[PDB]
């Protein structure tokens, strides 16, 4: 099972608009489903970029690869532009769970080597070491999108 860009050959102009407080990494899923990193967007920035109909994008925190949303969902697929308007890709923070947000902050303050020196239940060591990761999310998203044909 593979989530991947379609080689439509049909240009599509997109605005990547960063409406999050994070440095945003655009991630392009190539024709074999392999994630490819694109130049980053500082918070409060947008860029007009050239893509293709049926190409697949996701967006992460450039530093941690924490998940971000695009037009309120995890995946962005440009369609055909109408009347010379680019498609807007609005990149926003999810509402993280409190636990995930706490894991982000602790991960930001503590080296992976030192996770196990923290005074917490063992199951939280495992939660810390389960780092946000694009490949692991693609496996989940691939399963989710079966139903979306």
């Amino acid at each position: 099972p593979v989530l991947r860009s379609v080689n439509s050959r049909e240009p599509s102009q997109v605005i990547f608009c960063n409406r999050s407080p994070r440095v945003v990494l655009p991630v392009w899923l190539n024709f074999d489903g392999e994630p490819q990193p694109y130049p980053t967007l500082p918070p409060g920035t947008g860029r007009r970029i050239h893509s293709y109909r049926g190409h697949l994008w996701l967006f992460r925190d450039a530093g941690t690869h924490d998940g971000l949303l695009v037009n309120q969902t995890e995946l962005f697929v440009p369609s055909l532009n109408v009347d010379g308007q680019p498609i807007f890709a609005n990149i926003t923070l999810p509402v993280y769970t409190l636990k995930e947000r706490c894991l982000q902050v602790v991960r930001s303050l503590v080296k992976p080597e030192n996770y196990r020196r923290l005074d917490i239940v063992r199951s939280l060591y495992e939660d810390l070491e389960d780092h946000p990761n694009v490949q692991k999310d693609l496996e989940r998203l691939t399963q989710e999108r079966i139903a979306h044909q």
Partner: protein, 104 residues
């Protein structure tokens, strides 16, 4: 324009939102439904300033930008016991421990 508040008396803290258009009196009514003390037995404060019943929260200096869900604005609450109101008292939250070694 919603403002997000903590109404605080002693060791009591109420989390609620109100409209910037809503009044101090309407807030006392919210407090009355929760803590079973009528508005005439309450004083509400923004910092050290006693708030007037007829004032909107907007006019008291609460704004959506300074009263956020993740960072609510504090309203102090003092009750009338018998003849007179207590001195406004808000007990502080506990202190966090020293940053552990691995977090510095």
């Amino acid at each position: 324009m919603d403002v997000f508040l903590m109404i605080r008396r002693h060791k009591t803290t109420i989390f609620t939102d109100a409209k910037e258009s809503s009044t101090v009196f309407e807030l006392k009514r919210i407090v009355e439904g929760i803590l079973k003390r009528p508005p005439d037995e309450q004083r509400l404060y923004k910092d050290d300033q006693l708030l007037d019943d007829g004032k909107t929260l907007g006019e008291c200096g609460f704004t959506s930008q300074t009263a956020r869900p993740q960072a609510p604005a504090t309203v102090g609450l003092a009750f009338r016991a018998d003849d007179t109101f207590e001195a406004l008292c808000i007990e502080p939250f506990s202190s966090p421990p020293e940053l552990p070694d691995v977090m510095k």
